Design a protein around this ligand. Structure first.
Ligand SMILES: O=C(O)c1ccc(-c2oc3c(Cl)cc(Cl)cc3c(=O)c2O)cc1
Ligand SMILES: [Cl-]
Ligand SMILES: [Cl-]
Ligand SMILES: [Cl-]
Ligand SMILES: [Cl-]
Ligand SMILES: [Cl-]
Length: 331
């Protein structure tokens, strides 16, 4: 059958942790008091679901309340355990409390209050240095959660909040996150279509942290090329076709043969044969001040079919694309 795969880095982090760190089903959720918080107003209305600004009356502090949609108890405890494990990490949203409605028993997460200038307003006015800076901030969050044995599995602009005034960034929406365990098969119905890695589109279940690095590559390509989204597929099959129309089908079939991925029969005729299009083909005039040789080389090392060939978050942070960004943050 499929050839087994292991992550290149952070492979055994959860194995060296105590069991209670990652065994979220055995964790006992200690719910707080809902009456400690009063809702003030809706936040991100139209784009975000059940996100409220609230006041913690026990200390007169502003917080954010996220009322969760009805899902299984297993997924609730998983997200809570992951948020608590990552609390305090760089650029990770901070979980403040866990409350539940008395009568309806609806779960709700309480987060720290930060500013959010959504990408829809910044996608049109991001500088070349601003792209590098915020990419690096996302990489810090990804390296941390990967080093803590966590896959985010839903990296996309909607799940990244940017405080443009304070130059701050938070990775949010950890409802699809999971713990990485060597040899475990994972669900392929994760992330959004435009940011799904090829391992999800070919139903290879033994993926790892490198899935997040593909999604990040999709975000970078949309920013420096001014094409949102960069891989604009209309269904799951078309998503892999649009990727194949850029990376070529030669490396896709080598990827399929490397891990003995039994691709479905009709899907093989869908892909057909496509040559690899060089990254300079997507550059023109308006998106020209954002494309550099180091930007294309960095993007090329993220958008690889082979999940084991993509850069890790740490290797990405040391790419020359961030050379000046690294030295400027150190001051
Ligand atoms: O479930 C989650 O992972 C999650 C976590 C945090 C937030 C969150 O959203 C905000 C929005 Cl949409 C607008 C504004 Cl102006 C501020 C915030 C904010 O401070 C904040 O923490 C939303 C969802
Ligand atoms: Cl949402
Ligand atoms: Cl998005
Ligand atoms: Cl899973
Ligand atoms: Cl496309
Ligand atoms: Cl990594």
């Amino acid at each position: 059958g499929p050839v087994p795969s292991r992550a290149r880095v952070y492979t055994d982090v959860n194995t060296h942790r105590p069991r209670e760190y990652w065994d979220y089903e055995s964790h006992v959720v200690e719910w707080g008091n809902q009456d400690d918080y009063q809702l003030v107003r809706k936040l991100g209305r139209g784009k975000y679901s059940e996100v409220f600004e609230a006041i913690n009356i026990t200390n007169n502090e502003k917080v954010v309340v996220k009322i969760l949609k009805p899902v299984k108890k297993k997924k609730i405890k998983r997200e809570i355990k992951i948020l608590e494990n990552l609390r305090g990490g760089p650029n990770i949203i901070t979980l403040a409390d866990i409350v539940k409605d008395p009568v309806s028993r609806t779960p709700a997460l309480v987060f720290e209050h930060v500013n959010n200038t959504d990408f829809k307003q910044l996608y049109q006015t991001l500088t070349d240095y601003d792209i590098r800076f915020y990419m690096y901030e996302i990489l810090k969050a990804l390296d941390y959660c990967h080093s803590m044995g966590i896959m985010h599995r839903d990296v996309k602009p909607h799940n990244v909040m940017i405080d443009h005034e304070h130059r701050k960034l938070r990775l949010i929406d950890w409802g699809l996150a999971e713990f990485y365990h060597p040899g475990q098969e994972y669900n392929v119905r994760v992330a959004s279509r435009y940011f799904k890695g090829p391992e999800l589109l070919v139903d290879y279940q033994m993926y790892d942290y490198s899935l997040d690095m593909w999604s990040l590559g999709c975000m970078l390509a949309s920013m420096i090329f001014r094409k949102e989204p960069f891989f604009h597929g209309h269904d799951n099959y078309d998503q892999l076709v649009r990727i194949a129309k850029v990376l070529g089908t030669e490396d896709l079939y080598d990827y399929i043969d490397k891990y003995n991925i039994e691709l479905d029969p009709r899907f093989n005729d869908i892909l057909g044969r496509h040559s690899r299009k060089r990254w300079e083909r997507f550059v023109h005039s308006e998106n020209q001040h954002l494309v550099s040789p180091e930007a294309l080389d960095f993007l090329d090392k993220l958008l690889r079919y082979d999940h084991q060939s993509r850069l890790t978050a740490r290797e990405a942070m040391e790419h020359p694309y961030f050379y000046t960004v690294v030295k400027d943050q150190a001051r």
